[PDB]
Amino acid sequence: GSVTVPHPNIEEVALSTTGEIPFYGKAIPLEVIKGGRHLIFCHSKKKCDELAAKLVALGINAVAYYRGLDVSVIPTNGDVVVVATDALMTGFTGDFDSVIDCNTSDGKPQDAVSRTQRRGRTGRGKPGIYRFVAPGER
């Protein structure tokens, strides 16, 4: 079927029930988004609002970017984690320590290029890391 391009520069990880920020059946350990800058990919705008504001309460500076959103994400305040869907349109991304994604759009499993395009975020200068909720389909 579709063959996504490889990319060993990024380490792949499997989200698990470990952390304080509850996610799609997984618990994101702040160690993946706290301690620096991270980009979280979400499939729902309502969650981007709580997920980002919630991080501010956890101790992380988080922002949500989606259709109809205001420029708020700022990579110049210590440690900021950007949680957005396909609205950031990269441009200045790439410099992230890791990318936490749900690997499923609209509740359905993403498509081959989705991770190909989404994975391209961590690994600009060093080995990026990618943590996803679901591994794939079967």
PDB file of N, CA and C in Angstrom, residues 14 40 46 49 52-53 62 71-72 76 82 96 107 109 113 118 121 123:
ATOM      1  N   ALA A  14       6.267   4.820  22.610  1.00  0.00           N
ATOM      2  CA  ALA A  14       4.821   4.470  22.713  1.00  0.00           C
ATOM      3  C   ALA A  14       4.224   5.078  23.985  1.00  0.00           C
ATOM      4  N   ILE A  40       2.895  19.107  20.877  1.00  0.00           N
ATOM      5  CA  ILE A  40       1.898  18.006  20.998  1.00  0.00           C
ATOM      6  C   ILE A  40       0.877  18.101  19.868  1.00  0.00           C
ATOM      7  N   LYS A  46     -11.160  21.497  21.050  1.00  0.00           N
ATOM      8  CA  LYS A  46     -11.602  21.635  22.469  1.00  0.00           C
ATOM      9  C   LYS A  46     -10.529  21.096  23.415  1.00  0.00           C
ATOM     10  N   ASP A  49      -7.478  23.451  23.895  1.00  0.00           N
ATOM     11  CA  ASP A  49      -7.684  24.560  24.870  1.00  0.00           C
ATOM     12  C   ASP A  49      -7.393  24.076  26.294  1.00  0.00           C
ATOM     13  N   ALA A  52      -3.568  22.752  26.707  1.00  0.00           N
ATOM     14  CA  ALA A  52      -2.554  23.842  26.839  1.00  0.00           C
ATOM     15  C   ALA A  52      -2.735  24.590  28.163  1.00  0.00           C
ATOM     16  N   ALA A  53      -3.923  25.045  28.454  1.00  0.00           N
ATOM     17  CA  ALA A  53      -4.138  25.772  29.738  1.00  0.00           C
ATOM     18  C   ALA A  53      -3.806  24.847  30.907  1.00  0.00           C
ATOM     19  N   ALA A  62       2.196  26.066  28.057  1.00  0.00           N
ATOM     20  CA  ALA A  62       1.644  25.374  26.871  1.00  0.00           C
ATOM     21  C   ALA A  62       0.659  26.248  26.104  1.00  0.00           C
ATOM     22  N   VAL A  71      -2.273  34.017  17.871  1.00  0.00           N
ATOM     23  CA  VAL A  71      -0.832  33.718  18.064  1.00  0.00           C
ATOM     24  C   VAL A  71      -0.500  33.802  19.553  1.00  0.00           C
ATOM     25  N   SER A  72      -0.209  32.688  20.158  1.00  0.00           N
ATOM     26  CA  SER A  72       0.110  32.686  21.615  1.00  0.00           C
ATOM     27  C   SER A  72       1.373  31.869  21.885  1.00  0.00           C
ATOM     28  N   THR A  76      10.166  31.534  23.788  1.00  0.00           N
ATOM     29  CA  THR A  76      11.181  32.411  24.442  1.00  0.00           C
ATOM     30  C   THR A  76      10.764  32.733  25.880  1.00  0.00           C
ATOM     31  N   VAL A  82       4.041  23.331  22.704  1.00  0.00           N
ATOM     32  CA  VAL A  82       2.950  23.749  21.783  1.00  0.00           C
ATOM     33  C   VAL A  82       2.058  22.559  21.443  1.00  0.00           C
ATOM     34  N   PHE A  96      12.251  20.987  18.243  1.00  0.00           N
ATOM     35  CA  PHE A  96      11.506  20.482  19.435  1.00  0.00           C
ATOM     36  C   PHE A  96      12.202  19.249  19.995  1.00  0.00           C
ATOM     37  N   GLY A 107     -10.558  10.664  15.779  1.00  0.00           N
ATOM     38  CA  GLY A 107     -10.819   9.365  16.465  1.00  0.00           C
ATOM     39  C   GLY A 107     -10.339   8.199  15.591  1.00  0.00           C
ATOM     40  N   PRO A 109      -7.507   6.251  13.003  1.00  0.00           N
ATOM     41  CA  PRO A 109      -6.028   6.165  12.877  1.00  0.00           C
ATOM     42  C   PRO A 109      -5.543   7.076  11.745  1.00  0.00           C
ATOM     43  N   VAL A 113       1.207   9.232   5.451  1.00  0.00           N
ATOM     44  CA  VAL A 113       1.947  10.531   5.421  1.00  0.00           C
ATOM     45  C   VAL A 113       1.745  11.324   6.719  1.00  0.00           C
ATOM     46  N   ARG A 118       3.938  14.652  10.377  1.00  0.00           N
ATOM     47  CA  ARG A 118       3.972  15.006  11.830  1.00  0.00           C
ATOM     48  C   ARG A 118       5.334  14.660  12.442  1.00  0.00           C
ATOM     49  N   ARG A 121       9.434  16.965  13.018  1.00  0.00           N
ATOM     50  CA  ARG A 121       9.300  18.089  13.988  1.00  0.00           C
ATOM     51  C   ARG A 121      10.467  18.031  14.977  1.00  0.00           C
ATOM     52  N   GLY A 123      14.306  16.566  15.933  1.00  0.00           N
ATOM     53  CA  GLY A 123      15.491  15.988  15.236  1.00  0.00           C
ATOM     54  C   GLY A 123      16.248  17.074  14.467  1.00  0.00           C
TER      55      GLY A 123
END
